[PDB]
Amino acid sequence: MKETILVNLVSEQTIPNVQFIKWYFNKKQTPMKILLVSTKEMEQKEKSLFIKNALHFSDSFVEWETIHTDGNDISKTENILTDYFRDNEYKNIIVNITGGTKIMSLAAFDFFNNKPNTEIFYQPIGKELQELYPNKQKYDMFEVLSLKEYLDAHGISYKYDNECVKDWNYNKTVYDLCVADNRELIKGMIALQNNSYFNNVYKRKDFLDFTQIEEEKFIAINHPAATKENMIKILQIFGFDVSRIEHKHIRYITGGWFEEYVYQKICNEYHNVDEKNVALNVTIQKGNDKNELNVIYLDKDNKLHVIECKSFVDGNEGNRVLNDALYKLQAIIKSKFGLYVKQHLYTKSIIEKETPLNRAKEFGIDIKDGTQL
Amino acid sequence: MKETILVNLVSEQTIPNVQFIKWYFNKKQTPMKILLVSTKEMEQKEKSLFIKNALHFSDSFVEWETIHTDGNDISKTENILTDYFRDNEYKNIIVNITGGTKIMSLAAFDFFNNKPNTEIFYQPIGKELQELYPNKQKYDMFEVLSLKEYLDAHGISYKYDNECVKDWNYNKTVYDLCVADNRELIKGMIALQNNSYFNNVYKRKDFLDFTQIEEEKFIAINHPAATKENMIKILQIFGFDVSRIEHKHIRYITGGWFEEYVYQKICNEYHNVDEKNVALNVTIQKGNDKNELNVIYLDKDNKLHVIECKSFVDGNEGNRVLNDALYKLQAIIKSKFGLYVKQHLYTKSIIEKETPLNRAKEFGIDIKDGTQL
RNA sequence: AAAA
Ligand SMILES: [Mn+2]
Ligand SMILES: [Mn+2]
Ligand SMILES: [Mn+2]
Ligand SMILES: [Mn+2]
Numbered sequence: 235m236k237e238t239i240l241v242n243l244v245s246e247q248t249i250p251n252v253q254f255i256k257w258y259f260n261k262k263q264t265p266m267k268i269l270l271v272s273t274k275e276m277e278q279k280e281k282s283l284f285i286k287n288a289l290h291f292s293d294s295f296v297e298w299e300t301i302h303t304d305g306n307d308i309s310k311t312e313n314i315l316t317d318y319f320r321d322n323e324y325k326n327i328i329v330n331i332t333g334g335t336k337i338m339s340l341a342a343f344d345f346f347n348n349k350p351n352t353e354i355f356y357q358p359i360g361k362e363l364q365e366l367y368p369n370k371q372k373y374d375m376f377e378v379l380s381l382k383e384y385l386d387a388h389g390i391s392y393k394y395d396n397e398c399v400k401d402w403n404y405n406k407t408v409y410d411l412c413v414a415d416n417r418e419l420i421k422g423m424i425a426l427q428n429n430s431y432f433n434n435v436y437k438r439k440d441f442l443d444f445t446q447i448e449e450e451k452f453i454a455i456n457h458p459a460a461t462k463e464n465m466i467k468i469l470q471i472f473g474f475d476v477s478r479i480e481h482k483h484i485r486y487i488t489g490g491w492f493e494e495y496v497y498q499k500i501c502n503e504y505h506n507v508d509e510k511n512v513a514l515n516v517t518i519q520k521g522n523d524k525n526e527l528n529v530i531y532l533d534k535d536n537k538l539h540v541i542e543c544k545s546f547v548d549g550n551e552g553n554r555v556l557n558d559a560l561y562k563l564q565a566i567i568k569s570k571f572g573l574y575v576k577q578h579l580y581t582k583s584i585i586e587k588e589t590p591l592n593r594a595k596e597f598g599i600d601i602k603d604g605t606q607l
Numbered sequence: 608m609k610e611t612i613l614v615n616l617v618s619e620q621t622i623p624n625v626q627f628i629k630w631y632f633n634k635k636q637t638p639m640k641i642l643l644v645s646t647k648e649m650e651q652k653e654k655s656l657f658i659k660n661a662l663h664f665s666d667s668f669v670e671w672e673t674i675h676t677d678g679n680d681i682s683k684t685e686n687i688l689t690d691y692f693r694d695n696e697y698k699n700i701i702v703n704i705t706g707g708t709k710i711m712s713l714a715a716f717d718f719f720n721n722k723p724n725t726e727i728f729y730q731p732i733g734k735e736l737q738e739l740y741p742n743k744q745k746y747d748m749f750e751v752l753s754l755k756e757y758l759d760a761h762g763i764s765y766k767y768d769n770e771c772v773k774d775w776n777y778n779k780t781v782y783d784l785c786v787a788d789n790r791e792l793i794k795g796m797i798a799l800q801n802n803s804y805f806n807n808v809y810k811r812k813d814f815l816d817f818t819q820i821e822e823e824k825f826i827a828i829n830h831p832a833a834t835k836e837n838m839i840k841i842l843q844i845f846g847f848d849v850s851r852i853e854h855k856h857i858r859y860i861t862g863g864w865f866e867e868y869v870y871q872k873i874c875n876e877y878h879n880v881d882e883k884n885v886a887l888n889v890t891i892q893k894g895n896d897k898n899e900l901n902v903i904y905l906d907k908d909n910k911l912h913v914i915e916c917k918s919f920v921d922g923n924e925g926n927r928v929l930n931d932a933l934y935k936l937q938a939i940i941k942s943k944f945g946l947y948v949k950q951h952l953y954t955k956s957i958i959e960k961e962t963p964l965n966r967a968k969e970f971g972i973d974i975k976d977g978t979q980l
Numbered sequence: 981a982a983a984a
Contacts, residue, residue: 570969
């Protein structure tokens with residue numbers, strides 16, 4: 235038997251348990267059992283598994299044990315804890331009461347309070363960790379978690395590249411130098427990307443010689459701006475080799491530049507964020523349900539930020555696009571992540587219509603529009 | 608001399624406090640003092656205001672009092688309670704520890720436990736209320752809240768219109784008799800409703816005679832089915848009078864029939880639902896942000912149900928429509944309401960594509976499709 | 981902060 239046991243209560247929010255266990259283990263540096271006190275409801279949602287997989291401890295140090303209580307029955311939980319610590323003698327007992335129902339938390343606290351060789355902790359959301367007993371004091375959780383740990387703790391599998399077509403020195407100026415004065419030309423390329431033929435050919439080939447393509451395909455686009463001459467012209471404004479155009483170059487022009495700009499700006503200028511915890515164009519998946527997130531990052535307070543980028547949302551069409559994006563962003567973050575997340579919408583346009591502003595305010599979506607970017 | 612005082616802890620979920628207070632006031636039916644223990648964070652979110660407005664007790668029965676604690680400081684809540692209750696002579700101190708942080712709840716329990724004039728309660732979500740002290744007892748919270756009380760507890764105003772164009776006997780067969788064989792005709796009327804003129808004329812008036820409209824108004828819709836002859840036909844298949852067409856007759860054909868079917872099915876066949884707590888064609892509003900909800904109801908266990916109706920989601924367009932509807936429904940219910948809500952999508956179509964099925968399952972959206980309707 |  236190990237000399238130390240870490241007692242945690244399992245509930246919907248896995249992060250307070252992952253954060254505490256990782257912090258305590260790396261302070262303590264000793265073999266231990268981690269006891270997860272769970273329920274039938276939480277085991278159906280695999281919460282104990284998500285906790286274990288986020289921590290990925292080796293078998294040399296850590297033993298796991300999951301026991302089950304009725305989360306709403308204070309006597310059954312008191313009895314289970316009482317019998318457990320009669321049957322198993324530990325020299326150091328560490329209890330995190332942050333998780334569970336209030337019934338589970340109350341039973342644990344009332345059982346462990348004032349006992350010898352016992353320490354009791356509670357983590358308020360967004361604050362320093364507290365020791366409640368035996369010595370009241372606070373501990374800073376600064377930089378404890380990584381982005382991967384946060385996603386693992388939610389049972390979310392993911393894939394990202396952080397591949398950028400242009401570097402930060404270029405994207406810092408691409409709006410002024412290439413985008414702002416060529417908006418009409420860009421609408422053509424947007425049409426080009428959504429055109430039938432061009433989309434299908436890029437499923438089979440990696441690049442395309444734009445000079446070698448027939449003008450019938452450019453007129454089949456149906457757009458005033460989308461001529462063979464203009465597409466060659468805007469491709470060269472952005473520095474691409476018109477003889478070897480791959481799809482990501484088109485996507486860069488049609489709005490990928492703003493995703494890269496936001497991603498690199500965070501990596502280079504946001505003081506409460508480390509580069510290493512920032513991700514661009516992430517695919518997340520859970521229960522075979524897939525979503526694409528433009529930019530996400532974990533800040534140094536271990537809080538997740540999720541950004542949807544919309545380069546421009548001007549017009550009657552841009553307002554419908556913006557409205558749809560507010561719902562989609564809100565649904566994803568409320569459904570895939572726990573409490574400790576902030577959602578943002580970034581755009582170059584200036585948002586002044588009452589409907590998106592009031593919706594974002596009600597939703598808690600932080601809007602960062604042209605006035606600040 | 609209030610011989611009874613209720614004490615409640617204020618947190619994000621207002622329903623457990625509103626439900627408990629209404630239940631207890633209805634049980635004892637004597638004047639009482641009601642103490643709210645709140646925090647600066649919850650007052651910023653107006654949570655005690657929502658609780659009191661939902662209950663709208665008369666000054667002649669209830670004295671509301673409010674004291675303030677730190678949500679994360681166990682000794683602060685103990686001290687706040689100690690000072691307020693010192694030397695008290697209440698006959699009955701009724702303590703609801705369901706709300707607050709675990710720190711608040713714990714502090715409250717430890718303060719009131721084992722006292723001679725206290726009773727301590729905890730409400731597990733979706734279960735029987737529990738008395739914890741001095742006896743272990745359970746109570747059913749059946750039919751405690753009204754739909755209006757639930758929405759007031761969230762600070763939400765709403766309007767609705769329960770008038771149905773057709774009765775339940777007609778709506779039980781309208782799909783087979785009128786819809787299934789005229790989908791293309793109805794697609795014409797769907798195009799009619801979106802047309803700028805037809806939408807405009809009905810904003811400046813109420814009644815339109817369809818015989819006196821020029822054909823050029825219909826050809827201007829640009830739908831192969833939206834002729835003058837075809838629309839008159841479908842208006843007659845549903846049994847209306849072409850001289851006096853209201854926007855509601857049109858809305859009935861374009862999908863209102865299915866909303867009415869769902870609404871009437873709830874009122875006529877859902878045994879755990881009181882018809883007075885069901886609402887059709889709802890507009891909810893908070894912070895000047897409005898949402899249209901097809902059908903909502905509070906069931907007899909005080910749980911809110913929110914329904915989006917989509918008559919048909921067949922085809923490429925239908926799946927994009929259905930996808931947008933899932934995000935919109937999820938965004939609204941996760942943002943506007945607390946934990947105690949269930950969201951549903953009702954459709955006549957059969958949903959079997961993997962993407963919507965897995966999205967709905969991850970979101971917890973209950974799909975009632977044609978296999979059940 | 982009805983299962984940070
Ligand atoms: Mn985007
Ligand atoms: Mn004092
Ligand atoms: Mn029943
Ligand atoms: Mn609908």
